[PDB]
Design a binder for this molecule. Structure first.
Ligand SMILES: Nc1ncnc2c1ncn2[C@@H]1O[C@H](COP(=O)(O)OP(=O)(O)O)[C@@H](O)[C@H]1O
Ligand SMILES: [Mg+2]
Length: 758
């Protein structure tokens, strides 16, 4: 018989055991005879007999192991079937292309009210089960989309939101408003990175709120830590926020004239990264030459199946129009973006023998004049504010004034993003709700050749939502089966709590130590990294940069960084700028300048000075987890198929790692013997009690239940009685749902089914 043995690029490979050794097992690869390779007994797994067949729920496999899970997903993906279940947990593999019809209004309809497994695996099925559960259990529900940057969490978040609003959303205006919020938030909070062209530089929790009649009454979006660094500088293969690029590419000649824009290369805050636009043959025609940078003219447009800076400019303006933003609201946003750009251009030169600190360069006068009109400020008030920091006024050197000009741009932009999120929430408000369905789209786990505070926070976040997973799915589920007395085989796992204890320990964790450094008279990123390593050498999720597998990082000094061996893989961090990046506060000179601005819109944005970024984020996430622990949790596991952003290119070994890190290999072991559907046999009996005859009344609840299942052709293997509740095996969700249907015409109809059974 043929088995699954390891392969370096495919993850696994087919062949049969030809010989047994003390340490290992000699395997001969299938297709070609004679040639052999050796693999360990533990590294060898049984395969399915039918290699061509695919299953919708991995729990239906003959052999439930990491090699059979990978193969099922692989086959499904080749046939363009990106969704697969592991009981009620959905695995989504990024197609990197538009699969026709699978997100159509026809498909949306086909999924409505259908039980899990009575339709193919789909995000819609996860969204509908979460709606059924809300309506039935009278308990608010949470949808958690996980995966690394490029996995497909943002697209899947959007798919679910489109399903819910189209399905259970009135038919009125509010329904589409929740949908048109994402392209607006993506304009300001999404940017081209190397892992993803449409990367989410912020985390979000979108709640769809319902009344007791289970009809949408509005929504609420929560946002988490928009990347401030990206506003000023980027790397040649990455860009600033999409808004800058859509505006430069698609603005009417009047807007270009009014905002004083030109090709991205003229702007400091853009020209360090990519100055190329997302376009095709058609759209590249629609962008005027006075917007095209030399890089664009020499190398061409950036290619993307979904992104298009021109087509997305009109599409965002149309989203603003559909959510109630008038032409004034629109321009005010544009003036701030433009103001931020011109602000960036402002350059300084050493004064020495005049003021002491520095002045503004002679060719920075245009930038200053333009920046002032857009931000409703006096040019000199601005000129003073950037060159002299009062602390009794004090002058600033060239480097210090550069830091000042960037700090103000960052705050101004962030405040515009907080305004957009707010204005978005204002387009779908409500006085009160009963239950909600919230979708969690964090910023996915990322790492590059150079990793600072940004990555440390994004990954600390990814750590937290993975801790919620271990809790809900493995710790609590096994605890239930145990408390009820089912004797399901215990599954031990690689817990990610130690990593979190390392970061957020009150007074002695990385975050509270970093805070202490900011609070010192002369802070240091070197002194910071020292105290981190000195408290107290030992910890499994921490190592000095020279201990990295990648050559690149082995040149980093002990005090210059640290590696964090995360759940999703190890990431070496360069601790430079950590202290600075941990200060959310803005000097009061710049704070007062922008607050006392002759422009209402700018004033309205703004409603030792130190504010911890890290601990503000700890607080933010801890509120979210409380919100999350109160709801019923549903999980979507997005998988990135390759690192080349291509379709029909399944990297086996790469996906296998993702299946292992997400703990889906662990879940698969527990679902092999777990019962995902369950109900109290007394509450179930009491629900039917009003319509059952004396004969059925005299019987103990367990016996009526046993008879009702034995009427709906269930099997002794399918269900199992606990101490208080009845439990149901995977692939029996359809059955479980009808058994649980609280509708009196169904309940009484089922008593008749039972009566004839005897
Ligand atoms: N289900 C999908 N269907 C089509 N394209 C997808 C899908 N999921 C992801 N993509 C592609 O991958 C890109 C990035 O996916 P995204 O949703 O932004 O992932 P994440 O937020 O997890 O990094 C999208 O712009 C799109 O081109
Ligand atoms: Mg995203």
């Amino acid at each position: 018989k043929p088995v699954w043995a390891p392969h370096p690029t495919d993850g696994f490979q087919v062949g049969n055991i030809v010989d047994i050794g003390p340490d290992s097992l000699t395997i001969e690869p299938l297709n070609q005879k004679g040639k052999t390779f050796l693999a360990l007994i533990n590294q060898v797994f049984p395969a399915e007999e039918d290699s061509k067949k695919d299953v919708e729920d991995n729990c239906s496999l003959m052999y439930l192991n990491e090699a059979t899970l990978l193969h099922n997903i692989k086959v499904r993906y080749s046939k363009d079937r990106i969704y697969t279940y592991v009981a009620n947990i959905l695995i989504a593999v990024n197609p990197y292309f538009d699969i026709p019809k699978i997100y159509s209004s026809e498909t949306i309809k086909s999924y409505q009210g259908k039980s899990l497994g009575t339709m193919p695996p789909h995000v819609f099925a996860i969204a509908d089960k979460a709606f059924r559960d809300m309506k039935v259990l009278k308990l608010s529900q949470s949808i958690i989309v996980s995966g690394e940057s490029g996995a497909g969490k943002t697209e899947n978040t959007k798919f679910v939101l489109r399903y819910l609003t189209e399905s259970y959303g009135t038919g009125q205006d509010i329904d589409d408003r929740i949908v048109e919020a994402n392209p607006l938030l993506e304009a300001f909070g999404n940017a081209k990175t190397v892992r993803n062209n449409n990367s989410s530089r912020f985390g979000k929790f979108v709640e769809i709120h319902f009344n007791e009649k289970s009809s949408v009454v509005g929504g609420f979006v929560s946002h988490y830590l928009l990347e401030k660094s990206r506003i000023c500088v980027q790397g040649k293969e990455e860009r600033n926020y999409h808004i800058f690029y859509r505006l430069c590419a698609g603005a009417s000649e009047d807007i270009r004239e009014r905002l004083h824009l030109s090709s991205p290369d003229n702007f400091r805050y853009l020209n360090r990264g990519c100055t190329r636009y997302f376009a095709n043959k058609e759209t590249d025609k629609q962008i005027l030459q006075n917007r095209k940078s030399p890089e664009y003219l020499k190398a061409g447009s950036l290619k993307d199946p979904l992104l298009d800076d021109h087509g997305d400019f009109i599409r965002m303006c149309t989203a603003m129009k559909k959510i109630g933003l008038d032409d004034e609201e629109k321009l005010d946003l544009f003036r701030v973006v433009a103001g931020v750009l011109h602000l960036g251009n402002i350059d300084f030169e050493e004064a020495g023998s005049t003021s002491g600190g520095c002045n503004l360069k002679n060719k920075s006068t245009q930038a200053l004049e333009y920046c002032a009109e857009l931000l409703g400020l006096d040019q000199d008030d601005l000129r003073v504010s950037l060159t002299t920091r009062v602390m009794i006024k004090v002058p600033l050197k060239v480097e210090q004034a550069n830091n000042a000009r960037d700090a103000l741009a960052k705050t101004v932009y962030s405040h515009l993003f907080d305004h957009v999120v707010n204005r978005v929430n204002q387009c779908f408000p409500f006085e009160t709700s009963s239950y909600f369905i919230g979708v969690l789209d964090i910023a996915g786990f990322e790492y590059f050749e150079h990793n600072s505070f940004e990555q440390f926070c994004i990954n600390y976040c990814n750590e937290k939502l993975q801790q919620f997973f271990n809790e809900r799915i493995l710790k609590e589920e096994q605890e239930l089966y145990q408390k009820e007395g089912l004797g399901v085989n215990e599954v031990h796992y690689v817990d990610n709590q130690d990593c979190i204890d390392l970061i957020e320990a009150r007074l002695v964790g990385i975050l509270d130590i970093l805070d202490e450094e900011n609070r010192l008279p002369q802070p240091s990123d070197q002194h910071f990294t020292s105290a981190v390593h000195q408290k107290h050498k030992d910890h499994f999720r921490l190592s000095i940069p020279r201990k990295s597998k990648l050559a690149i990082h082995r040149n980093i000094r002990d005090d210059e960084g640290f590696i964090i061996r995360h759940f999703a893989g190890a990431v070496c961090y360069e601790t430079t700028q950590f202290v600075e990046k941990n200060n959310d506060a803005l000097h009061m000179s710049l704070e007062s300048l922008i607050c006392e601005s002759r422009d209402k819109f700018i004033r309205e944005l703004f409603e030792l000075s130190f504010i911890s970024v890290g601990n503000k984020f700890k607080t933010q996430l801890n509120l979210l987890l409380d919100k999350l622990r109160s709801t019923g949790a549903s999980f979507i596991r997005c998988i990135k198929p390759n690192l080349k952003m291509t379709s029909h290119h399944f990297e086996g070994a790469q996906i296998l790692s993702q299946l292992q890190c997400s703990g889906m290999v662990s879940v698969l072991d527990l679902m092999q013997g777990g019962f995902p559907s369950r109900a109290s046999f007394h509450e179930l009996y009491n629900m039917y009690k009003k319509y059952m005859p004396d004969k059925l009344a005299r019987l103990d609840p367990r016996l009526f239940c046993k008879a009702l299942f034995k009427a709906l052709g269930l099997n002794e293997i399918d269900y199992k009685f606990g101490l208080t509740k009845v439990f149901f095996r995977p692939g029996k969700f359809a059955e479980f749902d009808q058994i649980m249907k609280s509708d009196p015409d169904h309940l009484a109809e089922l008593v008749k089914r039972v009566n004839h059974w005897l």
